[PDB]
Design an enzyme around this catalytic site. Structure first.
Site, short mmCIF file in Angstrom:
data_model
loop_
_atom_site.label_atom_id
_atom_site.label_comp_id
_atom_site.label_asym_id
_atom_site.label_seq_id
_atom_site.Cartn_x
_atom_site.Cartn_y
_atom_site.Cartn_z
N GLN A 146 -0.81 4.95 3.94
CA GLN A 146 -0.02 4.83 5.16
C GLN A 146 -0.27 6.00 6.10
O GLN A 146 -0.34 5.82 7.32
CB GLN A 146 1.46 4.71 4.78
CG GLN A 146 2.44 4.28 5.86
CD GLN A 146 2.95 5.42 6.70
OE1 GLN A 146 3.00 5.33 7.92
NE2 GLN A 146 3.34 6.50 6.05
N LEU B 221 0.83 -1.19 0.00
CA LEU B 221 0.00 0.00 0.00
C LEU B 221 0.87 1.25 0.00
O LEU B 221 2.02 1.24 0.46
CB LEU B 221 -0.96 0.02 1.19
CG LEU B 221 -0.48 0.24 2.63
CD1 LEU B 221 -1.61 0.81 3.45
CD2 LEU B 221 -0.04 -1.06 3.24
N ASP B 222 0.30 2.34 -0.52
CA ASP B 222 1.05 3.55 -0.81
C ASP B 222 1.33 4.35 0.47
O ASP B 222 0.90 3.99 1.57
CB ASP B 222 0.30 4.41 -1.82
CG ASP B 222 0.24 3.78 -3.19
OD1 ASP B 222 1.17 3.01 -3.53
OD2 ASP B 222 -0.73 4.05 -3.93
N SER B 223 2.06 5.45 0.30
CA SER B 223 2.34 6.35 1.41
C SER B 223 1.10 7.11 1.84
O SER B 223 0.95 7.45 3.02
CB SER B 223 3.45 7.32 1.02
OG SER B 223 2.99 8.21 0.01
#
Lengths: 128, 96, 65, 176, 165, 87, 459, 119, 73
Positions: free
Chosen positions: F46, F41-43
Site C-alpha cells: 500500500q 494486499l499488505d500495508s
C-alpha cells in the site's frame, strides 16, 4: 558500521537514535498523552478565539507578552551580585577595552616617536 | 488503521463546502471589469542627442579643465594635418 | 493552435526548431573546421621551438678548457 | 507529535523507515531500473523477518535498521519541489492574500465587481447565520472537561455546516 | 565568459520552465530530441567550455594557461590550474550526460513547448555571439603586452590533452 | 503552465496507473475498492502504491495521512485538496 | 534672528484662539510658513560668521541644524494625532502649545552667543519634553523613563555651569569670538583636567556615550512619537553642536586626556551595534542605532580634524532625518497593531503595498546607500580616524558590517515573508502617513543632490 | 622541464640562480663581439605611444603593424604579414635570450667544475 | 477535458533493460518487481536514444559538405 552519532550543541539529535523512546513505560505514555491534552486545549481555545466573525483585533497571545515581559523588564529583578557574575562582567567589560587601549597606546607611541624623528613619508600628506 | 466515520463525514462536508467555494470563485459577468470612461526612435535618437550636444559645446567651453583627450598617436610614416609637414620615415630594417 | 500534450508518448515537434538546431550546430562545425583549416595550426606554435639553445659548444662564447 | 494520538506505533515507525529508505535510494540511484532492482532487494531484506512474534527483537532490529540506514543515507535527498525544504517552500506566496482583505476597497472598485461581491455578501451571511448558537452548542456539547484530542466531530445532528469551517474553506488556491 | 554563460543560464532556465520548475538533475535524465534547439544550445556551451580548438573559448583560456606556463609561477598553482581544467571538463561532460543523454526520466503529462519567438531570438542571438564575438574581440585590439609565442613541446599540447583525458 | 485538470480525468489517471501495476487485476477493481479488505494486499505494498502516486503527481503526502487512504476515491479527494481541481 | 523668533511667540495664541476642528490646519499652515521664513536665512559667506545683533549669531554649523529643526516641526505636528485626536480640546491645545514652546527653546539654544545663555536654553530645551513623554508615554514605565531622563541629564549637565562661570570670571566675557581671539592654551595641571572632564562629561551625558547610554531606550520606547523625534534628532544633535561650540578651548590637554573617551566610544559603538541585532521591541532598535551613530560622532568630535568636523555635521543631520523617519514608521506599525514587538506582526508585503517602499528607502539610507548624506558623514569620519590611527579602521568597518546587518534584519524581519493570518484588523495606508514619508525623503535626496550646504564651518 | 628537476634535486651551482643572471664578466671569450644596432628611433618611439615593457628591440615591426592596422580598419583581416614578421623578430629575440641563458649556464658549468675539480 | 487515454495492455513489458533486470532478479530468486510503469520511458520515440559521442557529432551533416564547398570554391 556507523560511529553512532555523537551529539553537540549544534549537531541536533535526530528522531531515530534517541534511544530513550524505546524504553516505553507507563510514565512516558502518560506524559506524552497529557502533552497532547495540553496542546489540544490550547488549540481549542485558540480556534474559539480565532474563528469568530465579530472579533476585530489581534488574538492577544499572553504567552508572547509573557516572553517579552520575561525578556525585557524581568532582567534586573531578580538578581544577586555573585562571584561568577562579577568575574564575567569584569572579564567582558573592561578586559577588551584595556586591550584596545593598550594597542592604541602602542601605535600612537610608534607614530609620535617616528614623526618626532621626522622619518615619515610626508612629502605630501595633506589630508590629515 | 483507517478513516473513522467522523473523519469521513467531516471531510465530505468540507468537500461540499470547498467545492462550492471554488465553484463560486470563478468570476464571470462575461465582462471582468468596466471602465469609468517610429516616433520612439525619433525622440530617443534626436532629443537627448540635441540636449547633450548642446551641453557638450557651450558649458564645456565655459569650464576649462573638463573633457580631455588622450593623444592621437602619430607614426614615422605619417604627416601632420594641421600645418602640413611629415615626420621623416622610419630608418633601415636589416636582419629580417 | 499551440502545441498539445500527450500522455506517456514522445512529444510532437515542428520542422522549424529542429532545422534551426541542425543548422546552428552545422554552422559551429563549419566555423571550427574552416577556422582550423585557414590560418592555424594552433596545435603548434607557428614556429619551430628550438633545442636547448643549439647544443653547440665553442659557439656562444667559451674558453678552451 | 501528531494531532490524533500521543505516539504513532512500532508499525508506523517501520513503515516510515521503509518510505524514507525508498526515497533516499531514489536519490542515491540513477537510471531507475537498477534502482528498481535494489528496491526489490530492500523489499526482500524487509521480508527477512516479518514473522517475528517477539517485540524486543522487533524494536531491536528496528533500531539496528535505523543505524544501517543512517550509515547509508544521502546528503541531498530528492525532496519534491512542492514540499517545504525543496524548491517550492510556498514558491508563489507573493499572491496568497487572505480573504479578510478584499473588503477594504473603495465602493468604486466594489461597483466594478458587483456580482462577486454580492455572492460574497451571501457567503458572509451564511457565516454569520448559524455561527453563534449551533457551533457553541456543539463545542460545549461533545467533549469531557479534558479535550484530549485535536479533531472535532461534524454536524451530524440535524442541519447546518460542521463547526469551525471558515479558515479551512477560505484559503488561497495554492497557485495564485 | 559573459557571452558564454549568459547563453548557458538562459538555455537552462528555458529547460527548467519547460519541465514545470523542478530544476533538479534527477528526474531530468534524458531530453535530447525533446526539441534539439535547447540541447544544441547546451552542448555548444558545455563543449565551448575548455576551448574547442579554436573557438571563442580557446582564445582566452588557452592564452591564460600558456602565459601562466611561461611565467614565474608559485610551483603549485600551475598544477592547480591543470587539475581544475580537468575537473571542469569532467563536470561539463557529466552534466551533458545526466541532463540530456541518459534514460529519459521526468514525470508524465509533458508540457514541453517552445513555440516562441522570444526564446528562439534570444538563444539564437547568443549562440551567434558565442560563435563569432570571441574572434571579433580577439582580432582588433591593440596588443598592450608581449605575446610569448615560443612554447616547448608537451606544454602547448597539455591543455587539450588534459581536457580530452 | 497548468493543464486543465478535472476530477474524472485525474481519477481515470490514478486508476490507470493502479491498473498498470501487476499483482492486482483490472477485473474486480473499481472506485469503491479497498486496499486491505477485498484485494487483501499488505500495508507495505500500500505504501508502494502511495509512492507511485507521489512519483507521478510530484508531491509527497504527510505521514499523518499515510495510514488512512485505503481506496481510490479518498485519494482523489486528497489530490483535489492539493491542486484545487476546478475552473 | 528675532524676526525668526517673534512669529513663534505669536504662533502660540494662534492655537488658543483657534476654535474646534480648526487648530490643526492653522498650526500646520503657519509652521510651514515659518519653514519658508527660516529657509530664507541662508546668506552666510566666506570669512566670518553671520551676526544677528549683539545677542545672536550663527556659524555655518548652527544654520543647517536650525533649518532642520524648523522643517522637522510641522512633520511632528502632523505626526502627533490618532493617539490624542480623541482627547480634550484644552489638553490638545496645551500639547500643541507645549510643542511650540519647545521649538522656541530649541531655536534659542542653537542661536547662542554666550555659553551661559546656551546653558539656560539647554535645560529649557530639557524641561518640556519631560512633561510630554511622561504624560503621553503610553506604557507602564514612562514614570521611570522620564525620571532617569531628567536625573541623568541634570546630574551630568550640572558641573558645566560651574566651569562656565569660572571661564566667565577669569578670562573676560563669553562671546564666541572673545572666547576665541583671546584664549591662551591652558597647560596640563590637574585642575585643567577636571574642568575639561566637567564640560566634556556633561555633553557626554547628552550624546550619550556608552557608559551612560541606558538613559536613552526607555525614554524612546515609553514615549509618544513627538517627544521621541524631538528627543532623538534635536536633543542628541543639539548636544553634539554644543560640544562643537565648547571644544575650541583647551587644546593642549585634550590630546593627552582624550584617549579613554575615544576608547569607550569605539567599544560601545561595537557592542551597541551588537546589542540591537537580537532584541525585540522594534522601537528600541532605532534607539540603539542612534547610540551607535552618536558614538561614531563622538569619536569624530574628539579627534580634531576639519575632515572630521565635516563628516561630523553631515552624519548629524543625515542621521537626524533617518532616525526621525524610522521612528515615524515604527509609530505607523504600532498604530496598525498594538503590540510594539517584532516577531508578531510579520508579512506586510502583500498589504500596505507602498509602505514597503518607504521601509526600503529608510533602511537603505540607514544602510548608508552611497550617494546619501549618511555615507558622506560616515566616510569622512572613517578617513579622519584612519589619519588619526592606522588600526581603528577595523572597528569602523566592523560597525559598518553589523550596522548593515541589523538594519537589513529589521527590514526583512517585520516586513518580509508571511502574514500570520490572525491579525485581520489592519486597514490600508492613509494619505497622512505617506504625506509624512514624502515630507521625510524629499529633503534628504535633495541634499544628496546639493550637499555643499550642510558641511560645517571648516568647509 | 627536467631542468626544474635538476635544480630541485642536484647541486645548486650549475643551475644558475634566476633573475641574478649577469654573473661572469662579459666579452669573456668574445672579444669584439657586439654591434647592438637599435635602429628603433627613440624619439619616434616616444611619438608612437607604446606600452612600457615594449620600448625594446623589434619595435619597428610593431610600428609598421600598428600603422597598417590604423590605415586598414575595414580590412578586418589584411594585416598579417607584418604581424607574423613581428612574431618572427620576437621569436629570434627569445632565441637570443635562450642562447644567453645557456651561455651563462655552460660557462658556469664548464669553468667552475674545471677550476673546483682541478684545483 | 478529454484525453483519449493512450492506454494499458499495450506495453507487455519487453523493454530490454527491464527484461534483463527481470532475468537477473529471477535468477536471484525474487521474481516479483513493481512492473510495467516505465515502458513508456524505455520504448516508443525513445529506445535507441543516441549515445554520448553522437550528440557531440550531431553537427557534421551540413558541416563537411559546406567545408568541402569552402575549400573548393
Amino acid at each position: 558500521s556507523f560511529p553512532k552519532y555523537e551529539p553537540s550543541r549544534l549537531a541536533s539529535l535526530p528522531t531515530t537514535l534517541d534511544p530513550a523512546e524505546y524504553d516505553i513505560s507507563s510514565e512516558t505514555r502518560k506524559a506524552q498523552a497529557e502533552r497532547l491534552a495540553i496542546r489540544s486545549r490550547l488549540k481549542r481555545e485558540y480556534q474559539l478565539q480565532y474563528n469568530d466573525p465579530s472579533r476585530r483585533g489581534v488574538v492577544e497571545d499572553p504567552a508572547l507578552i509573557r516572553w517579552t515581559c520575561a525578556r525585557s523588564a524581568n532582567v534586573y529583578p531578580n538578581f544577586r551580585p555573585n562571584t561568577k557574575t562579577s568575574l564575567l562582567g569584569a572579564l567582558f567589560g573592561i578586559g577588551p577595552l584595556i586591550f584596545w587601549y593598550y594597542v592604541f597606546k602602542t601605535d600612537r607611541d610608534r607614530k609620535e616617536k617616528l614623526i618626532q624623528e621626522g622619518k615619515l613619508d610626508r612629502t605630501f600628506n595633506i589630508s590629515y | 488503521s483507517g478513516y473513522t466515520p467522523d473523519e469521513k463525514l467531516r471531510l465530505q462536508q468540507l468537500r461540499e463546502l470547498r467545492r462550492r467555494w471554488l465553484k463560486d470563485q470563478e468570476l464571470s459577468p462575461r465582462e471582468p471589469v468596466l471602465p469609468p470612461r517610429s516616433i520612439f526612435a525619433f525622440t530617443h535618437v534626436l532629443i537627448p542627442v540635441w540636449i547633450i550636444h548642446y551641453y557638450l559645446k557651450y558649458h564645456v567651453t565655459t569650464k576649462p579643465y573638463t573633457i580631455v583627450e588622450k593623444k592621437p598617436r602619430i607614426f614615422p610614416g605619417d604627416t601632420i594635418l594641421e600645418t602640413g609637414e611629415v615626420i621623416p620615415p622610419m630608418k633601415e630594417f636589416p636582419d629580417q | 493552435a499551440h502545441i498539445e500534450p500527450r500522455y506517456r508518448q514522445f512529444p510532437q515537434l515542428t520542422r522549424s526548431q529542429v532545422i534551426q538546431a541542425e543548422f546552428f550546430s552545422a554552422t559551429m562545425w563549419f566555423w571550427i573546421l574552416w577556422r582550423f583549416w585557414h590560418d592555424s595550426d594552433a596545435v603548434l606554435g607557428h614556429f619551430p621551438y628550438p633545442d636547448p639553445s643549439q647544443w653547440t659548444d665553442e659557439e656562444l662564447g667559451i674558453p678552451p678548457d | 507529535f501528531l494531532p490524533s494520538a500521543a505516539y504513532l506505533t512500532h508499525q508506523q515507525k517501520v513503515l516510515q523507515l521503509y518510505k524514507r529508505a525508498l526515497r533516499h535510494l531514489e536519490s542515491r540511484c540513477v537510471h531507475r531500473d537498477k534502482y528498481r532492482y535494489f528496491a526489490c532487494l530492500l523489499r526482500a531484506r524487509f521480508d527477512e523477518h516479518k514473522n517475528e512474534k517477539d517485540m524486543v527483537k522487533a524494536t531491536q532490529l528496528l533500531r539496528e535498521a535505523e543505524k544501517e540506514f543512517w550509515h547509508g543515507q544521502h546528503p541531498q535527498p530528492y525532496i519534491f519541489p512542492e514540499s517545504p525544504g525543496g524548491t517550492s517552500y510556498e514558491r508563489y506566496e507573493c499572491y496568497k492574500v487572505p480573504e479578510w482583505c478584499l473588503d477594504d476597497w473603495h465602493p468604486s472598485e466594489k461597483a466594478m465587481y458587483p456580482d462577486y461581491f454580492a455572492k460574497r455578501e451571501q457567503w458572509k451571511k451564511l457565516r454569520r447565520e448559524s455561527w453563534e448558537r449551533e457551533v457553541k452548542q456543539l463545542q460545549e456539547e461533545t467533549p469531557v472537561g479534558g479535550p484530549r484530542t485535536e479533531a472535532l466531530p461534524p454536524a451530524r445532528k440535524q442541519g447546518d455546516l460542521p463547526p469551525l469551517w471558515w479558515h479551512i474553506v477560505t484559503r488561497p488556491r495554492e497557485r495564485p | 565568459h559573459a557571452f558564454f554563460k549568459a547563453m548557458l543560464f538562459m538555455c537552462s532556465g528555458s529547460i527548467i520552465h519547460s519541465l514545470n520548475d523542478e530544476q533538479d538533475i534527477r528526474k531530468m535524465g534524458g531530453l535530447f530530441k525533446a526539441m534539439p534547439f535547447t540541447t544544441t544550445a547546451l552542448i555548444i556551451g558545455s563543449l565551448a567550455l575548455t576551448g574547442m580548438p579554436f573557438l571563442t573559448g580557446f582564445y582566452s583560456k588557452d592564452l591564460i594557461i600558456e602565459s601562466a606556463n611561461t611565467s614565474y609561477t608559485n610551483a603549485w598553482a600551475l598544477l592547480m590550474t591543470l587539475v581544475a581544467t580537468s575537473f571542469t571538463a569532467i563536470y561539463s561532460t557529466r552534466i551533458i550526460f545526466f541532463a540530456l543523454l541518459g534514460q529519459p526520466r521526468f514525470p508524465t503529462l509533458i508540457n514541453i513547448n517552445e513555440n516562441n519567438p522570444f526564446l528562439i531570438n534570444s538563444i539564437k542571438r547568443l549562440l551567434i555571439g558565442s560563435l563569432f564575438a570571441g574572434f571579433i574581440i580577439s582580432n582588433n585590439i591593440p596588443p598592450m603586452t608581449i605575446p610569448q609565442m615560443t612554447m616547448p613541446h608537451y606544454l602547448k599540447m597539455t591543455a587539450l590533452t588534459v581536457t580530452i583525458l | 503552465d497548468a493543464p486543465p485538470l478535472t476530477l474524472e480525468g485525474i481519477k481515470d489517471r490514478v486508476l490507470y496507473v493502479l491498473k498498470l501495476y501487476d499483482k492486482i487485476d483490472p477485473e474486480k477493481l473499481s472506485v469503491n475498492s479497498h486496499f486491505m479488505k477485498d484485494l487483501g494486499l499488505d500495508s507495505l505494498d500500500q505504501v508502494e502504491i502511495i509512492m507511485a502516486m507521489e512519483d507521478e503527481f510530484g508531491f509527497e503526502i504527510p505521514d499523518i495521512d499515510a495510514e488512512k487512504l485505503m481506496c481510490p476515491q479518498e485519494i482523489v479527494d486528497y489530490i483535489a485538496d492539493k491542486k484545487d481541481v476546478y475552473e | 534672528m528675532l524676526k525668526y523668533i517673534i512669529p513663534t511667540m505669536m504662533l502660540m495664541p494662534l492655537t488658543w484662539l483657534s476654535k474646534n476642528s480648526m487648530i490643526w490646519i492653522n498650526t500646520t499652515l503657519h509652521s510651514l510658513l515659518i519653514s519658508l521664513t527660516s529657509l530664507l536665512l541662508l546668506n552666510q559667506f566666506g570669512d566670518n560668521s553671520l551676526n544677528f545683533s549683539l545677542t545672536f549669531f550663527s556659524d555655518s554649523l548652527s544654520t543647517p541644524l536650525l533649518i532642520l529643526t524648523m522643517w522637522l516641526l510641522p512633520l511632528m505636528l502632523m505626526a502627533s494625532q490618532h493617539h490624542l485626536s480623541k482627547e480634550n480640546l484644552a489638553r490638545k491645545k496645551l500639547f500643541i502649545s507645549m510643542l511650540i514652546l519647545l521649538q522656541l527653546f530649541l531655536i534659542m539654544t542653537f542661536t547662542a552667543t554666550e555659553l551661559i545663555f546656551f546653558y539656560i536654553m539647554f535645560e529649557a530645551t530639557l524641561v518640556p519634553t519631560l512633561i510630554i513623554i511622561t504624560r503621553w508615554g503610553n506604557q507602564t514605565e514612562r514614570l521611570n523613563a522620564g525620571l532617569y531622563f531628567l536625573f541623568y541629564t541634570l546630574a551630568g549637565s550640572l558641573p558645566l555651569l560651574v566651569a562656565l562661570i569660572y571661564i566667565q570670571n577669569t578670562m573676560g566675557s563669553l562671546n564666541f569670538l572673545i572666547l576665541q581671539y583671546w584664549v591662551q592654551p591652558m597647560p596640563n595641571s590637574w585642575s585643567n583636567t577636571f574642568m575639561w572632564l566637567a564640560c566634556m562629561m556633561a555633553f557626554m551625558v547628552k550624546m550619550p556615550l556608552y557608559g551612560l547610554h541606558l538613559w536613552l531606550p526607555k525614554a524612546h520606547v515609553e514615549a509618544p512619537i513627538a517627544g521621541s523625534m524631538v528627543l532623538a534628532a534635536i536633543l542628541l544633535k543639539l548636544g553634539g553642536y554644543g560640544m562643537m561650540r565648547i571644544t575650541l578651548l583647551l587644546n593642549p590637554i585634550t590630546d593627552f586626556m582624550a584617549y579613554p573617551f575615544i576608547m569607550l566610544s569605539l567599544w560601545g559603538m561595537i557592542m551597541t551595534s551588537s546589542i540591537c541585532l537580537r532584541q525585540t521591541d522594534l522601537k528600541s532598535l532605532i534607539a540603539y542605532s542612534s547610540v551607535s551613530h552618536m558614538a561614531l560622532v563622538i569619536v569624530a568630535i574628539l579627534i580634531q580634524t576639519p575632515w572630521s568636523y565635516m563628516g561630523a555635521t553631515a552624519l548629524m543631520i543625515a542621521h537626524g532625518l533617518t532616525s526621525s523617519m524610522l521612528f515615524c514608521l515604527a509609530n505607523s506599525n504600532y498604530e496598525r497593531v498594538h503590540s510594539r514587538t517584532m516577531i508578531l506582526a510579520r508579512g506586510l508585503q502583500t498589504l500596505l503595498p507602498l509602505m514597503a517602499a518607504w521601509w526600503l528607502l529608510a533602511s537603505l539610507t540607514n544602510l548608508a546607500l552611497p550617494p546619501s548624506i549618511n555615507l558622506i558623514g560616515e566616510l569622512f569620519v572613517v578617513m579622519s580616524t584612519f589619519s588619526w590611527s592606522n588600526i581603528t579602521i577595523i572597528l569602523m568597518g566592523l560597525n559598518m558590517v553589523i550596522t548593515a546587518l541589523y538594519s537589513l534584519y529589521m527590514l526583512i524581519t517585520t516586513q518580509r515573508g508571511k502574514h500570520t493570518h490572525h491579525i485581520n484588523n489592519i486597514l490600508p495606508s492613509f494619505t497622512r502617513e505617506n504625506a509624512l514619508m514624502s515630507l521625510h525623503m524629499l529633503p534628504l535626496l535633495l541634499l544628496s543632490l546639493n550637499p555643499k550646504i550642510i558641511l560645517g564651518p571648516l568647509y | 622541464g627536467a631542468h626544474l628537476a635538476r635544480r630541485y634535486l642536484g647541486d645548486a651551482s650549475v643551475e644558475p640562480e634566476p633573475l641574478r643572471m649577469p654573473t661572469f664578466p662579459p666579452d669573456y671569450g668574445f672579444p669584439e663581439r657586439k654591434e647592438r644596432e637599435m635602429v628603433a628611433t627613440q624619439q619616434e618611439m616616444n611619438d608612437a605611444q607604446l606600452v612600457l615593457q615594449q620600448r625594446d628591440y623589434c619595435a619597428h615591426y610593431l610600428i609598421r603593424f600598428l600603422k597598417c592596422k590604423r590605415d586598414s580598419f575595414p580590412n578586418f583581416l589584411a594585416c598579417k604579414h607584418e604581424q607574423h614578421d613581428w612574431d618572427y623578430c620576437e621569436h629570434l629575440d627569445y632565441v637570443k635570450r635562450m642562447k644567453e641563458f645557456e651561455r651563462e649556464r655552460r660557462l658556469l658549468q664548464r669553468k667552475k667544475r674545471r677550476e673546483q675539480r682541478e684545483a | 477535458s478529454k484525453m483519449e487515454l493512450p492506454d494499458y495492455k499495450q506495453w507487455k513489458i519487453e523493454g530490454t533493460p527491464l527484461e534483463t533486470v527481470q532475468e537477473k532478479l529471477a535468477a536471484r530468486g525474487l521474481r516479483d518487481p513493481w512492473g510495467r510503469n516505465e515502458a513508456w520511458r524505455y520504448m516508443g520515440g525513445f529506445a535507441n536514444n543516441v549515445s554520448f559521442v553522437g550528440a557531440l557529432l550531431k553537427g557534421f551533416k551540413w558541416g563537411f559538405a559546406a567545408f568541402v564547398v569552402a575549400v573548393g570554391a
